[PDB]
Every structure is written in C-alpha cells, then in structure tokens.
Amino acid sequence: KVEGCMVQVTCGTTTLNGLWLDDVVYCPRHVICTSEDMLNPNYEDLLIRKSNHNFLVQALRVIGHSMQNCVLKLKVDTANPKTPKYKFVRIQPGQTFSVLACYNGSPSGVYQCAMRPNFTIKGSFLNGSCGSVGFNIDCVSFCYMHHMELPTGVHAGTDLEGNFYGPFVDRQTAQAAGTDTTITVNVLAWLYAAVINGDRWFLNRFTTTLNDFNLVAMKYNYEPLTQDHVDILGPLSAQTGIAVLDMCASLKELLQNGMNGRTILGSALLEDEFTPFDVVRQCSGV
C-alpha cells in the first residue's frame, strides 16, 4: 500500500512528501531549495551543499543522495518493510491513474486523475502540498510525482525517473502570477525623491515599526518590508535626514487615506517603477 510508503522529507526550511521503496526515498529534487533558490536554481551546486545528514526522513538516516533528472533518490539505512512489488512507467495524457494526496507526510485521500492535453492535473486537493505520487494498481505501477503548484489549481509533475510531463521545469517565483503586488521599496525611494525635489506635503509627524507597517502592506497588496530594504534606502535617509521608518509612516497614511486630490512628483498614483538605484544615483548630484 502506497500509504505505508509515504514519508516526510525535510531539508532546511522546505518539507514535502517522499516515496519510500526499499532503502530509497524518492522525492522532488527542489526540497533542497528555498524561495530564493527556486527563481532559477543551480541544482548541482545546491546539492553540493547538502550532505546525507542535511536530509531528514520521517516515516530515518540517509546513507546516500543521488539525483536523477528532477527526482532526488535518498538511500536510507532502514529498508521499508511493506514495500509493494513496483515498476516505474510513463503514461500519456487522458489515461486515468490514482493519486494519493499527502500533506506534511500524512495521507489525506485517494483521487482518480487524468492529465490534460497540456500535461497538467487540475485539482484543488494537491494544493498546499508537494510530492504526492500517482499509480495504477493490478504490481503497483508508479507513474507520477507531484512537483509544482501553479496559480489556479494547476499541477505539474514528473514520472518516477524524474522527467517532467510536458514543458515544465522545477523553477518558480516567490510571487504567484496575477498577484500584482506593489514594490514597496521602490515607492519609498520615489517618495524620498519627491522630498529632495521639494514635495513635503505627505510627510507626517509619525513613525512606525516593520510589523505595524507590514500589516498595512499586506492589506493593500504591497511587498512587506525587511531590514534589507531599510538598509537599501540608507543613502536617501541620510541625504534627507528622514528615517526609513518615518517615511514608512507617511506611506502608511497615504495607503489608508489616499492622496486626497493631491499629486506627488506630478503623479496622482504612488509609483513603484523607480528602483532605489535609479533614485540614489539621480539624487546624488543634487
């Protein structure tokens, strides 16, 4: 039974399901990646980081790691006792197969599935999870492993040899498509540019914290601010004498109240296309 083979694999922050067959645990190779790495990952170098002790299997100690295309094959010290007789096969779209959805290493349910012509599975059950496997039962013919979640409940996966179905890669951005989140540090840089240009009407008497600001930012679909963003704006804060957190408080008021008919640098909208590099270089000559 696939339920007994399902295990939880953790590497650093990332955690997903794995398939435990004999002393090998199969899982998506992107478990070694964080959100920053998933952008466009150097899997060879990121795997050079990871050693056998970095991977954690919960059903266990890994005695070896071998990457085959997009699947990571982890040799473990304890062989799996209830391993079914299995084979690895590759299906085509429109052929039915059963997928056992697991979240945090514990199974949820068994769903009948069929890949669409674009090689994706449309289904909400796989969302929030990663690593669930598909199979046909007669021998257990494993045919599928869930790798990627796409915005509208659309899921991409590989076979058990690690080859993706369709033209998909295990790469993704931190922000989903259609989010359209405003780039906070760019808005702040543009506000500093407005002050250096003489626009002061929006500066208020208040300061704020990262936590308080980020509550507002999430409410209005702005990128939450980090200390790294704060440091980036360092030159502009020093030029104007206005602390970043003070400017954040001005922006918070602008988000909650709007511009109330006024403009900033000639615009009735808060602008986020100017990067701090653009602004710092242009403000330096002033």
Epitope: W190, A193, A194, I196, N197, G198, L265, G266, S267, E273, F274, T275, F277, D278, V279, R281, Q282, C283, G285, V286
Partner: nanobody
Framework: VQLQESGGGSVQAGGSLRLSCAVS????????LGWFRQAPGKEREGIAT????????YYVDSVKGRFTISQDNAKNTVALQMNSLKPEDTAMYYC?????????????????????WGQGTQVTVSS
C-alpha cells in the same frame, strides 16, 4: 549646453501637437531628457522622461499614453507627441536635460534632477 524647443501653438480640444527639442552642445553620453510643463501660478512639473541609454520612458498618470516621448540621437532631438489634448493641458512646455549619468534605467520627473533647460513653448488647448 543649449536646448531649444519647437512645435507649440494653439489647438482645439481633441487635437494633436508635436513638440521637438534640439539638444545641442552635449557630450553625446547617457543622459536624462524630460518634457516639463507649467501653468500660470502653478509649479513646473515633469510629465514625460526618457533615458538615452536604454530608452526607458516614464509618464505621469495624467498624460501617459496620450503623450509619447521620443529621442533621436542621430538628429539630436527629443520629441513629445501630444494626442487627444485637453484644456487642462494648456501650459508652457519646457524640454530639459540632466548631466551625464550611466547605470540607471528610469529618469525621475522632478525639475531638481535636470540641469539644462530650453526657453519654453506655449501649448493652448481651447474649448
């Protein structure tokens, strides 16, 4: 460094005008070029900018798309095509140039970020 604008005049609401500015005496390096406008009593405001490096353009919300800023380093001209003009577009229009600046992408629309200025041509949109 010298700058001279051209192409202003009077037009009816919904009409079109094309401004041109002769950038002269410049080092032919990467620069910020901007089109500014100023109504009587109102402050001068940049409305369209272009970076002669990568050619990225910025427009304020009120004139975006309707106005298109252009550059012609071969003829050393910066242009502003103004379509579907509105009476509130009535103002004196100035072209402006920064000093040489490399490595950036987008030029800010503030007057503080420009060094050389034209004489200003008047645009009058009547209703």
């Amino acid at each position: 460094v010298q700058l001279q604008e051209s192409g202003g005049g009077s037009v009816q609401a919904g009409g079109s005008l094309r401004l041109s500015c002769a950038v002269s005496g410049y080092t032919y390096s990467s620069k910020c070029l901007g089109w500014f406008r100023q109504a009587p009593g109102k402050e001068r405001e940049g409305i369209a900018t272009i970076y002669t490096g990568g050619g990225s353009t910025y427009y304020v919300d009120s004139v975006k798309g309707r106005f298109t800023i252009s550059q012609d380093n071969a003829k050393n001209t910066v242009a502003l095509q103004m379509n579907s003009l509105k009476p509130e577009d009535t103002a004196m229009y100035y072209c402006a140039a920064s000093g040489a600046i490399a490595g950036i992408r987008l030029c800010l629309p503030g007057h503080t970020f420009y060094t050389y200025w034209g004489q200003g041509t008047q645009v009058t949109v009547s209703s």
